[PDB]
Amino acid sequence: TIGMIALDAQGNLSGACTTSGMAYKMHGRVGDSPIIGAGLFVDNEIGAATATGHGEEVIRTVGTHLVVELMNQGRTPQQACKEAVERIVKIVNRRGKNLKDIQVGFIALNKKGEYGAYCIQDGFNFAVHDQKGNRLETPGFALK
Amino acid sequence: TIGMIALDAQGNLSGACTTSGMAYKMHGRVGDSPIIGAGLFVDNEIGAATATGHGEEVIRTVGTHLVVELMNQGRTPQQACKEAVERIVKIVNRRGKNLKDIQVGFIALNKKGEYGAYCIQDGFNFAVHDQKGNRLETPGFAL
Amino acid sequence: TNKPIVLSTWNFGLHANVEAWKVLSKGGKALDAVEKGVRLVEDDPTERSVGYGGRPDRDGRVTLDACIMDENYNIGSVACMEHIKNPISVARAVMEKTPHVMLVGDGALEFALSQGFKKENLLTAESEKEWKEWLKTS
Amino acid sequence: TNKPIVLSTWNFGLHANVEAWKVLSKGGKALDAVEKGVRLVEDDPTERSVGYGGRPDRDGRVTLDACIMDENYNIGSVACMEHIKNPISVARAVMEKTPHVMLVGDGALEFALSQGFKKENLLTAESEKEWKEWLKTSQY
């Protein structure tokens, strides 16, 4: 799975998300990648975000929309990603599930070019490309 | 399309959305009814919401998830439904579309048993059943 | 608080609410209530907007979409499913008897049948006729 | 304001970022940049988690999922589609040339072929082999 969000020279946002899904999944199974507000969501008035992790968990939590909406509430891209994860962390615990068996994270971007990234668990990485160059970065995580 | 949401004696919320989609649609076309956060979303800590009508616009704004999140911010069920359809009418105009060919309805309920609804065009009603009885109400009224 | 209470869309939602109330008023779970309610409209061929009797796509196929969500974020859904009268139940089956949350197309029916769901012709002679009539203009 | 800028998921995103930058760095549309960016990962058979070379379902079928969102609230998505190496491009066609926003299964493949998209064998030998090896240790 690969999720990508971008802000062009015009200050416009856009995003793409495409995957083959979970290997050896049931036939007809759909993950978060193609669901708007789950694997990806874009609002040229607030910002954008794309997810990572178990598609089943991202769908039930509508994470990506949650992140963008939180940015609409005044949160910076990073605070929105962190706040969204911490909320899903509670939801997970509510379901009596161990944080070690579930991963859900996001990378966000706002109209000012500001971005964020946060996940439940450590180990994920993403790529950022601006006038500073192309680089691999690590996000923040709740499990620690 | 029939969307249903309820709060039992335990104080637990649940929702259900089933439909046959837009008539004469492209073969594998899928609406908002099967998508969580679009045609339906439930959060026992806040409330539940479900929608009907042109699903394309509901998937577009993840309506239901928005309605619940709004109620989370403190808005009343009706207020959340109202704000959601408003965001839809704004995007409809922004995309250069005519609101005349669009109809979207939202019905919402919170943990206190408070409910409400709203839509774009006249003609959409909702049914509410509580300890007082079973009746039909017109969105936008009451509250 | 105003509980128990149920809400459903459109005028036919009134009769559907009665089936849900039967569960609610007795103290039944909201999940079972919202399932029994919408199912009433699924089995009704006079309601050509839900399940049985529903208007087909441009090809003359009746594909159903449905999803369910309980009080603890457990979800279940099915999209573009054919021959199954009650997709709301298949969605719940996917929620409880599957490690996934959403199934579509053939994979939906396959799983459905594997669960004991019967295969039926959801296209009523009335919907088939109205369809053919539409084909003319488009 | 920091722009342009591209964000990509996982390691292969670094290479996908380069493809998107070629567009963004020249003042190109963000929609065209993100589409081209992920397309590279779809065309790469070495990346078995996206498009071509992706690991199939238990039945051995490679079904892809994808969605796209632009700057004007336009959206497009396809799920459980097979035989089309670039599902992100077919999703853009759904958004641009269809009164809908989401297609799945054969109908999605039907529209794709109707737009000029070509039928291809996404199941690589490696992916086909590993799947057969799975079936054994899986008992399916």
DSSP state of D101: S
The shortest C-alpha distance from D119 to chain C (Å) reads 19
Which residues of chain C make contact with B81, given a CB cutoff of 8 A?
A: none
CB contact under 8 A, A94 and C72: yes
The CATH number for A55's domain is 3.60.20.30
> N- to C-terminal Cα distance for chain B?
26
How far lies A67's CA from each of A104, B64, D20, in Å? 12, 16, 23
**Alpha carbons C86 and A43: distance in angstroms, whole number:** 36
3-state secondary structure chain B: CEEEEEECCCCCEEEEEEECCCCCCCCCECCCCCCECCCEEEECCCEEEEEEECHHHHHHHCHHHHHHHHHHHCCCHHHHHHHHHHHHHHHHHHCCCCHHHCCEEEEEEECCCCEEEEECCCCCCEEEEECCEEEEECCCCCC
DSSP 3-state assignment of A27?
coil
D52's enclosing H/E stretch is: none
How far lies B31's CA from each of C12, C29, C78, in Å? 20, 27, 11
CA B3 to chain centre: 8
Contact present, A114 and A76 (Cβ < 8 Å): yes
Indicate the residue type of A3: G
Match 């109205």 to its residue by tokens. C130
Interface of A with C in 21-40 (CB under 8 A): 25-30
Candidates C75, C99, C108; nearest CB to A28: C108
Neighbours of C126 (CB within 10 A): 13
Domain range for A127 is: 1-144
Q: Of C130, A85, A28, which Cα lies nearest the Cα of D80?
A: A28
Burial of D33 (0-12, 13-18, 19+ CB in 10 A): buried
Number of structural domains, chain B? Answer: 1
What residue in C sits closest to A57 (Cα-Cα)? C101
DSSP 3-state assignment of A17?
strand
Resolution in A: 2.3
Both tokens of C108, joined, read 């939906």
Which residues of chain B make contact with A41, given a CB cutoff of 8 A?
A: 62
**Alpha carbons A118 and D116: distance in angstroms, whole number:** 40
Number of structural domains, chain D? Answer: 1
Q: State whether residue C113 sits within 8 Å of chain A by CB.
A: no
Interface of D with B in 21-80 (CB under 8 A): 72-75, 79
**Alpha carbons B39 and B106: distance in angstroms, whole number:** 9
The shortest C-alpha distance from A71 to chain D (Å) reads 17
Q: Could you confirm whether A61 is annotated as catalytic?
A: no
Domain range for C51 is: 1-138
Q: Give the CA radius of gyration of chain B.
A: 14
How far lies B30's CA from each of B26, B55, C64, in Å? 9, 8, 9
Match 């620690």 to its residue by tokens. A144
- Method for this entry: X-ray
Which chain C residues have any C-beta within 8 angstroms of a chain D C-beta? 57, 79-80, 104-107
B60 annotated as a binding-site residue: no
Both tokens of D123, joined, read 């199941």
Q: Of C94, D63, D9, which Cα lies nearest the Cα of A52?
A: D9
What residue in B sits closest to A59 (Cα-Cα)? B36
**Alpha carbons C28 and C7: distance in angstroms, whole number:** 16
The shortest C-alpha distance from C125 to chain B (Å) reads 15
> Which residue of D101, D113, D114 to mutate against B (max B Cβ within 10 Å)?
D101
**Alpha carbons C99 and C59: distance in angstroms, whole number:** 32
Please count the CA atoms within 13 angstroms of the CA of A69 that sit on its side-chain side.
23
How do strand B126-130 and strand C5-9 relate by DSSP bridges?
Answer: antiparallel
Match 């909702």 to its residue by tokens. B126
Please count the helices (runs of H) and the strands (runs of E) in chain C: 5, 4
What residue in B sits closest to C62 (Cα-Cα)? B20
Provide, for chain C, the percentages of residues in helix, strand and coil under a 3-state DSSP scheme, each rounded to the nearest 5.
Answer: 45, 15, 40
- B36: which strand partners? B40
Provide the H-helix boundaries in D64-104: 87-97
Whether residue D4 is preceded by a cis peptide bond, meaning omega within 30 degrees of 0, is yes
CA D18 to chain centre: 17
Provide, for chain D, the percentages of residues in helix, strand and coil under a 3-state DSSP scheme, each rounded to the nearest 5.
Answer: 45, 15, 40
Q: State whether residue C110 sits within 8 Å of chain A by CB.
A: yes
Contact present, C8 and C19 (Cβ < 8 Å): no
Q: Give the CA radius of gyration of chain C.
A: 16
Contact present, A4 and A17 (Cβ < 8 Å): yes
Contact present, A107 and A92 (Cβ < 8 Å): no
How far lies D94's CA from each of B35, C77, D120, D131, in Å? 18, 22, 19, 31
Q: Where are the beta strands (DSSP E) in chain D?
A: 5-9, 64-69, 75-81, 102-104
